[PDB]
Design an enzyme around this catalytic site. Structure first.
Site, PDB file in Angstrom:
ATOM      1  N   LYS A 288       0.347   6.561   4.534  1.00 40.33           N
ATOM      2  CA  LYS A 288       1.773   6.821   4.382  1.00 40.33           C
ATOM      3  C   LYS A 288       2.030   8.268   3.985  1.00 40.33           C
ATOM      4  O   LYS A 288       2.986   8.891   4.461  1.00 40.33           O
ATOM      5  CB  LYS A 288       2.370   5.867   3.349  1.00 40.33           C
ATOM      6  CG  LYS A 288       3.886   5.890   3.297  1.00 40.33           C
ATOM      7  CD  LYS A 288       4.445   4.791   2.404  1.00 40.33           C
ATOM      8  CE  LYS A 288       4.089   5.000   0.942  1.00 40.33           C
ATOM      9  NZ  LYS A 288       4.623   6.282   0.407  1.00 40.33           N
TER      10      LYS A 288
ATOM     11  N   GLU B   2       8.352   6.339  -9.732  1.00 36.91           N
ATOM     12  CA  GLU B   2       7.076   6.735  -9.162  1.00 36.91           C
ATOM     13  C   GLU B   2       6.017   6.808 -10.252  1.00 36.91           C
ATOM     14  O   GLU B   2       6.266   7.342 -11.336  1.00 36.91           O
ATOM     15  CB  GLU B   2       7.203   8.094  -8.475  1.00 36.91           C
ATOM     16  CG  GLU B   2       6.030   8.468  -7.593  1.00 36.91           C
ATOM     17  CD  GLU B   2       6.005   7.692  -6.293  1.00 36.91           C
ATOM     18  OE1 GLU B   2       6.938   6.894  -6.055  1.00 36.91           O
ATOM     19  OE2 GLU B   2       5.053   7.880  -5.507  1.00 36.91           O
ATOM     20  N   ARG B   3       4.840   6.260  -9.963  1.00 36.85           N
ATOM     21  CA  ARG B   3       3.709   6.462 -10.855  1.00 36.85           C
ATOM     22  C   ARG B   3       3.421   7.951 -10.956  1.00 36.85           C
ATOM     23  O   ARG B   3       3.245   8.631  -9.942  1.00 36.85           O
ATOM     24  CB  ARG B   3       2.476   5.721 -10.343  1.00 36.85           C
ATOM     25  CG  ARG B   3       2.661   4.237 -10.103  1.00 36.85           C
ATOM     26  CD  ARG B   3       1.353   3.619  -9.650  1.00 36.85           C
ATOM     27  NE  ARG B   3       1.466   2.203  -9.324  1.00 36.85           N
ATOM     28  CZ  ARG B   3       1.876   1.738  -8.153  1.00 36.85           C
ATOM     29  NH1 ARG B   3       2.278   2.550  -7.189  1.00 36.85           N
ATOM     30  NH2 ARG B   3       1.882   0.425  -7.942  1.00 36.85           N
TER      31      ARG B   3
END
Lengths: 50, 166, 488, 130
Positions: free
Chosen positions: C164, C190-191
């Site tokens: 991705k 988001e991490r």
């Protein structure tokens, strides 16, 4: 919840059924592929038996 | 002179000499690691010269700490440090780095590791110092003359039902 | 012009969690207004609040963008004179921002020349584009089977392990290369580990050139931030894209990762205010919250903003209100499968699982539609033939079936493309396939013109010409092998 | 009250005491019934929000100390055989041995209707047992 528990059990149980039967198809597929040799090797044995 | 940059592009300090002097002043080689930690925390990444001094400190120091630790191993400490300066902090060990390890093996008496290091130095470097090779072989002869080439328990025979699994 | 409520002073009346009530003597500012806690409090970061409700003519309820620890009652609060302001311009390229539009990259001042409010009304009905237009991404699979709609939303289904990140980077590079438009990435929930990885990778692909010109902005409302921030970071990124769309008239690309975390964040915020959740447990304003965001993403008469949003299906339930409401705004679907990746096909896209609404002759050229349908039909037949050959045997297929199988396999191999972003790692030079080439290349293969070319010549090549040159290099390469094997 | 008697025998008398409880679930049920009238918002399923702590305090008192030993056997009721219900599920962590009965086993004529695949014991280690 019990009703959710019941349905989850039922789904995986049916999945186990699909697995044990998917194997049967692979097996009987082999016993048929190997057994398809007769069609080419037939219809002349019984000529005079007719 | 030339300015190294970190992973995010920021500049880093290249003056490692002041910190190397601190390492040379450590009596126990566990203290040397603390100096290296302070170097990184100060955005001063140790170079080959810095790692070489640390290996020298391990060889020349009496013990890891003032009190004895159960399973101290200078060779393991050196090898662990070497993996850091090659696999993690991209750099290359040089001849001095391997020679220090070889000096530890002969000093400690682990002649078998000397064979491996000798093979490493010959393959990686030009060759292993013959003086260290002779000392390492001399240790091997001493063990075989005294009949201690391998630990005794391995030599002792065993069977299917005579082995205590424990 | 200046709003009268700028500099208005109030006092923190009530504090509960991330919700703070502020009392203004002269009157509460308008909703969505931003306020700063001037009180020192011995904190480590400044506290910003956003009015969300009006409790009375003087009291207003707000949500804190940072932690509300050490905040005492009666603390002074000063209005900023408007909604949250975010910098917009060409100076933000190659920079990382937060909800408040502050450079978190520690790479010097932004030096912007203008700022815009986070909340902006969507384009009016009169501003809509005259006609739908295709967005040439340069990728053979996307441009052929699931073409992108200029000003549309594309759901990029798929997780980690399918490439991705590279597809995202490739799209960012291609859009600027072809359409000369920029890109804005918005990491919602988001991490922080993955956000760092993306920044490092983008610097390696030079889509973020620190010493040169970058072609991407980053806006990261990571998980560690309170829900008040994760619900506005997407709007901040959208505001940046809107500037390029309108002032510059470009065709921007807005990536949102994910859109589900945007729903989750806005759901948590509503719960904090005490609103009764709807079915499943999402906020009652779920449809409106998405609408106020998606509707701002459209193709106007000035430019366009095509969004590629990563969609997450909770509990693998496609009927869940979150994905169900999201799908009502998606114009295209791009599905990534690990199985395709494990077969050596990159980008790992399942052509039969994707979909698009502009796959209609009224929008795309008639030839493009016919070719795409033929490819889909051939692929579907290929799957059926796969079942038969794995049951009765390959030799049992008729002459037509064998030809279909060969053509289909070439198509599957021909759908893989080398991305320019991967030149450093994979070494092989990438390719940008024009749409005109794509239609002709696939149209010829379907007819049977290239029935003599070897199958492997289509694997990881770009365009029909690449297929031919690689065939020369293969035929000539094998020529030496024969002279060797003949000899020796 | 019963536990207090056991504690006294454990400490003051220094004896090894057995403590049978039937049923420990009712203790949780009683608290839930009164919790609503105490102005406490019900938790999931409908138990009081203090289900974990209230049970934890009682269970921790049921233990063997350096003075004496208490061997505790508690019967736990699983509403509608739903072993994932919060009340039974919060008790498994306070027990050394868990005997999980099953209705299907009982219907087959097997008594005691113990499901060995769901039961566990802490002393099931080679060091403790032979």
């Amino acid at each position: 919840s019990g009703k959710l528990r019941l349905y989850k059990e039922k789904l995986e149980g049916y999945n186990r059924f699909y697995s044990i039967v998917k194997t049967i198809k692979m097996v009987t597929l082999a016993k048929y592929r190997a057994a398809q040799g007769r069609i080419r090797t037939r219809d002349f044995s019984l000529r005079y038996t007719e | 002179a030339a300015k190294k940059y970190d992973l995010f592009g920021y500049e880093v300090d290249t003056n490692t000499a002041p910190w190397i002097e601190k390492i040379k002043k450590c009596k126990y080689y566990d203290e040397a690691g603390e100096v290296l930690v302070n170097m990184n925390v100060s955005n001063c990444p140790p170079d080959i010269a810095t790692y070489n001094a640390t290996l020298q400190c391990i060889y020349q120091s009496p013990s890891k700490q003032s009190t004895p630790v159960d399973n101290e191993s200078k060779f393991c400490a050196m090898m662990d440090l070497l993996e850091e300066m090659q696999h993690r902090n991209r750099l290359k060990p040089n001849e001095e780095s391997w020679t220090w390890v070889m000096k530890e093996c002969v000093k400690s008496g682990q002649f078998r590791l000397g064979y491996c290091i000798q093979q490493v130095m010959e393959t990686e470097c030009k060759g292993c110092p013959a003086d260290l090779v002779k000392a390492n072989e001399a240790n091997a002869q001493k063990a075989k003359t005294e009949g201690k080439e391998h630990p005794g328990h391995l030599s002792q025979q065993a069977g299917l039902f005579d082995v205590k699994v424990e | 012009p200046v709003a009268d409520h700028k500099g208005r002073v109030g006092h923190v009346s009530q504090v509960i969690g991330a919700v703070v009530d502020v009392h203004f003597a002269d009157g509460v500012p308008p909703v969505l207004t931003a306020l700063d806690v001037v009180d020192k409090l011995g904190r480590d970061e400044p506290l910003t609040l956003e009015i969300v409700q009006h409790l009375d003519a003087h009291t207003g309820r707000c949500i804190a963008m940072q932690t509300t620890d050490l905040l005492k009652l009666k603390a002074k609060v000063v209005s900023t004179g408007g909604n949250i302001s975010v910098p917009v311009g060409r100076e933000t390229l190659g920079r990382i921002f937060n909800v408040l539009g502050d450079a978190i990259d520690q790479r010097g001042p932004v030096g912007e020349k203008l700022r815009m409010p986070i909340h902006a009304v969507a384009p009016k009905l009169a501003d809509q584009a005259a006609e739908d237009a295709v967005l040439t991404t340069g990728i053979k699979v996307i441009d052929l089977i699931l073409p992108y709609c200029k000003g549309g939303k594309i759901g990029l289904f798929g997780g980690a392990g399918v490439g991705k990140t590279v597809i995202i980077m490739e799209l960012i590079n291609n859009v600027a290369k072809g359409h000369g438009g920029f890109s804005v990435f918005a990491g919602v929930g988001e991490r922080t580990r993955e956000g760092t990885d993306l920044y490092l990778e983008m610097m390696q692909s030079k889509v973020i050139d620190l010493k040169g010109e970058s072609k991407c902005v980053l806006v990261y409302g990571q998980m560690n931030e309170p829900p008040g921030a994760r619900a506005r970071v997407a709007q901040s990124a959208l505001t940046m894209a809107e500037y390029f769309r309108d002032v510059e008239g470009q065709d921007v690309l807005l990536f949102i990762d994910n859109i589900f975390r945007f729903t989750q964040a806005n759901s948590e915020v509503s719960a904090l205010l005490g609103r009764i959740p709807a079915a499943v447990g999402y906020q009652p304003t779920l449809a409106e919250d998405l609408g106020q965001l998606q509707e701002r993403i459209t193709s106007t008469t000035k430019g366009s903003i095509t969004s590629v949003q990563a969609v997450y299906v909770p509990a693998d339930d496609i009927t869940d209100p979150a994905p169900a409401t999201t799908f009502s705004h998606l114009d295209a679907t791009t599905v990534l499968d690990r199985a395709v990746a494990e077969s050596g096909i990159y980008p790992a896209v399942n052509p039969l699982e994707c979909a698009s609404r502009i796959m209609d002759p009224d929008v795309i050229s008639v030839d493009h539609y016919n070719v795409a349908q033929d490819v889909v039909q051939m692929l579907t037949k290929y799957r059926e033939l796969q079942d038969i050959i794995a049951v009765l045997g390959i030799d049992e297929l008729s002459e037509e079936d064998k030809l279909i199988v060969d053509r289909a396999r070439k198509l599957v191999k021909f759908l893989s493309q080398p991305f320019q972003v991967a030149e450093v790692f994979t070494g092989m030079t990438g390719h940008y396939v024009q749409l005109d080439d794509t239609i002709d290349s696939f149209s010829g293969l379907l007819m049977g013109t290239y029935d003599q070319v070897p199958e492997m010549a289509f694997y990881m090549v770009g365009g029909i010409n690449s297929v031919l040159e690689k065939a020369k290099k293969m035929a000539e390469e094998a020529a030496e092998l024969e002279k060797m094997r003949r000899a020796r």
